[PDB]
Amino acid sequence: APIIKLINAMLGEAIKEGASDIHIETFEKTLSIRFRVDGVLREVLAPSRKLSSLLVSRVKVMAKLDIAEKRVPQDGRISLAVDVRVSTMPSSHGERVVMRLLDKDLHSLGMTAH
Amino acid sequence: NHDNFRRLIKRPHGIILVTGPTGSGKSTTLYAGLQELNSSERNILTVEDPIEFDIDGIGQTQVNPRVDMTFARGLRAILRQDPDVVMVGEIRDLETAQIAVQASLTGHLVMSTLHTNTAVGAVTRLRDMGIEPFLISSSLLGVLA
């Protein structure tokens, strides 16, 4: 389906930019996608509001979670070498999805000489 | 008072409580605080019983007794969404306060309310439920009677 490619391309774009978390959040009027690239949140894409249910449904079935259940929080896992941990949660305008992307010299990093 | 509250709700972590009796406009003050923080650079989520109204740009979960979704379970679920700021409707019991105190220590800014008559009454109330006297000093940023 078209929605299957969109989530896969989004995950590829998340790894491209070096994103840790991917925030799919549905509001009354707007559907918003945001990557927390190394801690800093970022507006990446705001698609049609109608897709909200389909994006939540696709990410659920990838992580082997319940599709019809939209009243309780559900945590799952996916293996793409990128190990993600999805975490859905109920809200006012449907569910809110977040999936944490995790990959399976000390002076150069930042530390001073002392 | 606004500038002092601004700086407090814009801290990276800690608990900020709004206290007073029933019909004292606590929610209205919290809602105004969240709307001020409502930016694209932060992830704000709330647990409410019930949701007073909808802030566009902020996630808002409701306490549902049909699926046993409580304040404690709702707050425990919100913390797994990678939030920057959290707003709990109110911390009525110890279990909900324990999670809020852990949340504040673990890099989250927490916001809530308590039905106490004074600003000292809030610090009081946390000591009553069973929060170790220390844990209040480390986490608590301030109280708004």
Side-chain angles (χ1 to χ4, degrees), chain A residues 20-21 23-25 27-30 34 36 39-43 69 71-73 75 87-93 96-98 100, chain B residues 39-46 51 54-62 64 66-67 69 73-74 77-84:
Chain A
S20 58
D21 299 45
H23 299 271
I24 309 172
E25 58 191 340
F27 305 110
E28 193 182 335
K29 294 172 169 63
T30 73
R34 287 195 297 174
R36 187 184 290 282
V40 182
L41 286 159
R42 189 185 298 175
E43 296 184 347
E69 180 66 290
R71 303 181 301 167
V72 304
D75 296 47
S87 295
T88 58
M89 186 184 68
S91 190
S92 57
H93 312 109
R96 215 191 85 98
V97 192
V98 176
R100 302 176 178 179
Chain B
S39 185
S40 58
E41 71 180 8
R42 289 205 199 79
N43 181 31
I44 298 160
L45 306 168
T46 78
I51 302 172
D54 180 44
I55 307 163
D56 185 34
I58 288 175
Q60 303 183 243
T61 310
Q62 188 162 307
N64 197 347
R66 295 181 178 179
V67 299
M69 179 102 298
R73 190 184 167 182
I78 270 182
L79 290 159
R80 298 194 293 277
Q81 293 285 311
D82 192 51
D84 292 311

Side-chain angles (χ1 to χ4, degrees), chain A:
Chain A
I3 305 301
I4 298 172
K5 285 187 74 177
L6 191 65
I7 297 300
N8 292 18
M10 186 178 69
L11 289 157
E13 189 62 30
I15 298 156
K16 172 87 85 68
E17 297 179 13
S20 58
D21 299 45
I22 299 172
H23 299 271
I24 309 172
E25 58 191 340
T26 307
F27 305 110
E28 193 182 335
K29 294 172 169 63
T30 73
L31 173 58
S32 185
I33 307 293
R34 287 195 297 174
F35 305 150
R36 187 184 290 282
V37 178
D38 310 329
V40 182
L41 286 159
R42 189 185 298 175
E43 296 184 347
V44 318
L45 173 58
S48 185
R49 209 287 207 178
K50 298 185 293 188
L51 300 169
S52 57
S53 58
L54 301 178
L55 300 184
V56 171
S57 184
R58 176 69 195 127
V59 175
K60 277 168 162 188
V61 296
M62 290 165 60
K64 309 148 176 53
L65 302 177
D66 198 340
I67 302 163
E69 180 66 290
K70 310 175 193 295
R71 303 181 301 167
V72 304
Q74 312 185 48
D75 296 47
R77 294 212 307 157
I78 329 175
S79 298
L80 307 177
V82 186
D83 181 37
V84 314
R85 270 87 178 284
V86 72
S87 295
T88 58
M89 186 184 68
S91 190
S92 57
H93 312 109
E95 289 168 299
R96 215 191 85 98
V97 192
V98 176
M99 43 184 164
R100 302 176 178 179
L101 309 181
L102 297 171
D103 300 0
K104 292 197 77 175
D105 185 32
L106 206 55
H107 173 65
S108 298
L109 289 164
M111 282 202 184
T112 58
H114 299 288

